[PDB]
Write a protein that binds this ligand. Structure first.
Ligand SMILES: O=c1ccn([C@@H]2O[C@H](COP(=O)(O)O[C@H]3[C@@H](O)CO[C@@H]3CO)[C@@H](OP(=O)(O)O)[C@H]2O)c(=O)[nH]1
Ligand SMILES: Nc1ncnc2c1ncn2[C@@H]1O[C@H](COP(=O)(O)OP(=O)(O)CP(=O)(O)O)[C@@H](O)[C@H]1O
Ligand SMILES: Nc1ncnc2c1ncn2[C@@H]1O[C@H](COP(=O)(O)OP(=O)(O)CP(=O)(O)O)[C@@H](O)[C@H]1O
Ligand SMILES: [Mg+2]
Ligand SMILES: [Mg+2]
Ligand SMILES: [Mg+2]
Ligand SMILES: [Mg+2]
Lengths: 673, 674
RNA sequence: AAAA
RNA sequence: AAAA
């Protein structure tokens, strides 16, 4: 702790405490974990020579580097202390030493505008024109290679730059590994406070105006993008500036000037003889209602895809063609023609997010809905059953959230035999909600048919998260999603014939009793009454008979009927005691099943046992045996029975669920599909 | 019709005269904006051309698509003569376009002094707030005034005239709650922001009105790094110096973060609270000793990763200071490096508070373009690594995708049925299929180091910096397919054979390297797709290679259960389908009864000594044998052991034989579900 | 806020 | 280019 006290004592420049701690035995060379900072590094950074000397006399290593490889000597240049630079040079520092990114003391003096340090270092033999040597990894990225002059230019240090050029023989035209020279660096200054003076100085010393920065940006183009008439004027006074250069977007200085509505700059470019054959110049000026610029351009000789979506697409084709100003990566138009729906904070609109067609949900940037929607979407990219989040753009207090463009909602789809659609839609939604809860850590709170979106596939996707809640642990929030999911099950099974709102209006038990079949009834009940194992609820329910095809249900009935213990009614057999009813279970459809079957097929099946008289009896096992046996020889009866899967399910609607419930947690699970 | 508009746009009076006198439509509206020849003439401020169009019957008040009238356009152009002309033609001085813009507002927007003065004297309502469409209003658009327009557009003379001569309300607010002062500080034209700000304050503008992120004028001025604006705002009596934006940041904290020493010191001198955040530590990080001392003298104060492999490093990265690059927080450094790369490396990162892998590129590069264009186009492909986003900084491009634990190659470096091989190859097949057919690209670099493994352990396709459009070249698809075939062999061999020499040997050599018939047949089909190239990977997902041993065993039992097989029917479809013939070479099951245990064999024949016939060496009988034995064992286990393994071991060519024979018949119903 |  |  005394070690951490030492560093704090130094940081607060408390000489007495530092003395006290050192004389008490504190580790004078202690390095803090992430950074490798020592008391000495801190003392130099505070520019406190007295504290520095105190530390050295207590045994501080004078050249011990921190994690980025910086020495106390180099830090002394950053602080601008000639006294400290002198001291460390007498303690073994080398004037041209560098950190692990290649920064020397001289460069740092230039970076920080430290004139006296800079002069002192020069006179102690600092190499003025060293280009930074950095790590191999950085070098592949074209990092490294910068010089003190570039540093002075980029940081806007006019006096340092003058001294470098006139007194220290700095190479004005050196380039970094990105190909940038001092002039480019100056025009990349975030501190526009001295850019003009800097630019004048560099140009007068023979700086090359025809050099490129990152995105193909020339000095002239950067000056135009700074909207700086003075910079542009000075650059155009160069005798051999290449006025028609284009950036990485193929844009000239003139085109950019017109696009940025810089009339005076544009006119100057034209008068200097910039080509007007470089884009839609006149149309752009016209679009910006600049009649004066339109005339200037003309008097200087200026001239004059397939959508994925079916439902949208006619509109998307129009949106793809029309002019629209970009908002970051998003091209769209808040207009009735491109509106998908009305919304509390605007609407849903067609858009292109990275040339990709998307739906755009608008928000007031600060709003509770905005942060709920965006927080969930940012955290749920790995969830495949959610609508996929492309990205978001903020503009002027507005937030535009971009998301997979879908054809229609589940509700609209339903407004347009085995119901396979219900099965795989609910399956996708179950998986969506599950991943949301367990992986994403959110609940939805607004599970309803309008928020289920249908692909052109037609695959379903969960959407609308502006009422979602981050999960802290309150089981009531999960329960709400589950009981909306239960109502969603019934909504889909009923094919939208019952609105979702009056399903919400009625109780759980009323929703359950509204179920048209035992599978949906049992599934919904389980959603409404999950165990203590709420976490595994949706996982388990994906294996519920509701999701079994009619062929699969029929197959498992036959599979269980094929158990030899069933085929030969073994008394105390495990499967038979498992399948037995009990007080007080039943008004079951199959309590006297042999009487429910056709007379002809039943007597024909019983014929197989007439020698010993082991006829079928009204036990659940014999019924399963009956189903297994009938299934086998059926490959006359086929007409009298019809679809065998459909037949047994129709006359015994509670059988499948009964078998599942009975064998759900035993080794006989193996018979399930 | 088009020639007339063009004639007007070129101010060619004579040509306009000729076209009009020649019977051109004078009220033609172009498709994009509903522009007429008259709208253009007014925009060009050509009263002579306007008068010409009117005398040929141009509707003087016909609006374009956004609702703007010629009268409103005249204000934009700044033409008093045209404004006067249209008022005499039925224009109302306070009329507006569909977004609420009046002629007066437009004069203010465009800084047209003479137009503005004329309109005011003709009764323009100076203090109207824009009424816009219902949809825009729900977004809190609308509500702006001419004064806000002048302020935002930097029109100083217009602003003074509005304030001093026209009774403009200095403190009106738009629907976002912004006043003129806020609008002034949103000018993209900092040439006049000081004068505008000074003038508004002198007329009693409210300094404490919020902008669009909890931003006060003070905070906005600090963010402009503008000392003059900051000085002037601090001179206002009821300035709220301690207000925080929606990030909870004060003007002082932002000043320190932005390394604005003079501004920060001024704020401190004006009495700003120094309990704002890590003020001092931020100043230290920026090596500003003088700022540290100023702060101190004014009394300043002195989560779980998902990844296992990465995790410790992610915890460190989460904790340390790092400057943000847009939505990305990362550190190009060995400690956080995943791999070396041609244009930098792969690194740990947080893209929107989410852990990701970051691939670095030189921003212009061919590799960068190929990687990013593929990723942007493939977001709906669930089997690819998921694209979070990209950041472009200073000629560098940083591409963020899901962070995976390890590669396929690393994973497999670390009797049994190879469950892993089927599951990884299934995912990769679906990945490639979607890339080709949905995303419309070819990968071109299918190899084990580009298959990434989840914590699940699910497989994902990555690395797209060599991907191609795709434009129609079958050869491009072919290359992916034969890389895929080699990937199959590579995985089945558990990585014991390097992928590079797999690539070095021919297709026939790779096929012949297969250790079992299922991989052999699957690889051959990848190397030799038919006319159905597009459905190749989709069809092959149903190949026996992807059937579990249980499922292979089951289909055999299913086929063996056919009645025609049990009752060796004279002319049955299934028996003739299963029948070999010329010149099918010697299968392992040709004399199968001799290959059985064969104490098991006599026990099996025991079922047919009273009724029926003993097993013969036909394929049908072997399938019946398999079906029967399955039934018996379910009711022998010690002799056979695992039955699926048993039949596959002694008859390795049986499963593929049955599949090939029955593939395009109704008997495919006996196959597994997927 | 808004044109081939 | 780079500290708790
Ligand atoms: O190793 C074995 C061999 C056979 N069996 C069963 O013994 C019965 C004989 O059938 P098979 O002789 O093979 O054939 C029948 C018809 O299938 C068509 O021709 C014949 C009739 O004329 C069938 O049982 P069950 O019919 O379900 O009672 C078979 O499963 C075993 O259990 N284990
Ligand atoms: N990605 C998309 N593709 C197609 N249609 C979409 C869509 N996203 C939303 N929609 C449509 O717009 C409707 C509304 O979108 P959304 O559900 O996200 O807003 P919302 O319900 O939260 C607004 P409010 O609460 O005020 O009613 C959806 O029900 C759907 O009809
Ligand atoms: N999302 C991710 N998660 C974990 N590791 C990843 C990863 N993305 C890439 N890697 C690792 O980094 C290695 C290289 O990444 P990547 O394949 O994308 O670059 P690359 O092969 O195109 C560069 P080069 O051509 O120079 O060899 C990968 O093989 C893998 O080991
Ligand atoms: Mg909704
Ligand atoms: Mg909602
Ligand atoms: Mg790779
Ligand atoms: Mg690559």
């Amino acid at each position: 702790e005394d070690n951490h006290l030492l560093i704090k004592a130094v940081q607060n420049e408390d000489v007495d405490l530092v003395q006290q701690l050192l004389e008490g035995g504190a580790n004078v060379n202690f390095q803090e974990e992430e950074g490798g900072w020592t008391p000495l590094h801190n003392a130099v950074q505070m520019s406190r020579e007295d504290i520095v000397e105190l530390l050295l006399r207590h045994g501080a290593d004078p050249v011990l580097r921190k994690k980025n490889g910086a020495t106390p000597f180099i830090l002394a240049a950053i602080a601008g202390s000639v006294k400290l630079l002198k001291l460390f040079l007498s303690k073994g520092a080398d004037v041209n030493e560098c950190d692990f990114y290649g920064f020397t003391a001289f460069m740092e003096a230039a970076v920080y505008g430290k004139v006296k340090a800079l002069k002192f270092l020069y006179k102690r033999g600092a190499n003025v024109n060293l280009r930074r040597k950095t790590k191999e990894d950085q070098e592949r990225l074209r990092k490294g290679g910068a010089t003190a002059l570039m540093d002075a230019a980029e940081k806007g240090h006019v006096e340092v730059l003058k001294i470098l050029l006139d007194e220290m023989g700095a190479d004005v035209n050196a380039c970094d590994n990105m190909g940038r020279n001092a002039l480019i660096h100056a025009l990349l200054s975030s501190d526009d406070s001295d850019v003009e003076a800097i630019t004048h100085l560099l140009l007068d010393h023979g700086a090359d105006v025809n050099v490129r920065g990152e995105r193909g940006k020339t000095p002239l183009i950067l000056a135009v993008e700074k909207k700086h008439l003075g910079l542009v004027q000075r650059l155009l006074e160069q005798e051999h500036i290449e006025i028609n250069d284009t950036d990485s977007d193929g844009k000239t200085a003139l085109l950019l000037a017109v696009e940025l509505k810089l009339k005076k700059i544009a006119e100057l470019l034209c008068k200097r003889g910039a080509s007007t054959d470089c884009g839609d110049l006149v149309m752009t000026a016209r679009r910006n209602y600049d009649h004066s610029l339109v005339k200037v351009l003309l008097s200087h000789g200026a001239k004059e895809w397939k959508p994925q979506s079916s439902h949208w697409g006619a509109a998307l084709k129009d949106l793809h063609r029309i002019y629209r100003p970009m908002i970051g990566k998003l091209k769209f138009f808040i207009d009735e023609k491109y509106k998908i729906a009305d919304t509390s904070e605007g609407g849903i609109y067609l858009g292109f997010y990275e040339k990709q067609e998307v739906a755009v949900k608008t928000f007031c940037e600060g709003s509770p809905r905005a942060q709920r929607e965006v927080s969930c979407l940012q955290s749920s990219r790995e969830n495949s059953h959610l609508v996929t989040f492309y990205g978001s753009e903020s503009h002027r207090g507005h937030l535009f959230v971009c998301v997979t463009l879908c054809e229609q909602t589940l509700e609209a789809c339903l407004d347009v035999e085995e119901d396979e659609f219900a099965r795989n839609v609910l399956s996708s939604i179950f998986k969506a909600v599950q991943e949301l809860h367990l992986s994403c850590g959110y609940t939805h709170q607004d599970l309803q048919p309008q928020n289920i979106l249908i692909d052109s596939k037609k695959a379903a996707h969960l959407a609308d998260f502006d009422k979602s809640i981050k999960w802290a642990g309150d089981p009531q929030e999960v329960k709400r999603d589950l009981e909306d999911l239960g109502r969603l099950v019934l909504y889909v099974v009923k094919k939208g014939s019952i609105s979702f709102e009056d399903l919400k209006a009625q109780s759980n038990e009323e929703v359950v009793q509204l179920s048209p079949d035992e599978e949906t009834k049992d599934l919904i009940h389980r959603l409404f009454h999950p165990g203590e194992h709420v976490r595994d609820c949706l996982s388990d329910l994906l294996g519920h008979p509701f999701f079994w095809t009619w062929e699969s249900r029929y197959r498992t009935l036959r599979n269980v009927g094929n158990e030899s213990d069933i085929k030969t009614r073994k008394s105390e057999s495990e499967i038979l005691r498992l399948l037995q009813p009990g007080p007080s279970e039943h008004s079951k459809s199959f309590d006297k099943w042999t009487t429910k079957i056709n007379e002809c097929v039943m007597k024909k099946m019983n014929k197989f046992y007439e020698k010993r008289g082991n006829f079928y009896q009204n036990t659940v096992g014999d019924l399963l045996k009956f189903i297994r046996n009938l299934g086998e020889n059926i490959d006359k009866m086929k007409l009298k029975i019809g679809d065998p899967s459909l037949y047994f399910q129709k006359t015994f609607p509670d059988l499948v669920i009964y078998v599942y419930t009975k064998l759900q947690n035993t080794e006989y699970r193996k018979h399930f599909p």
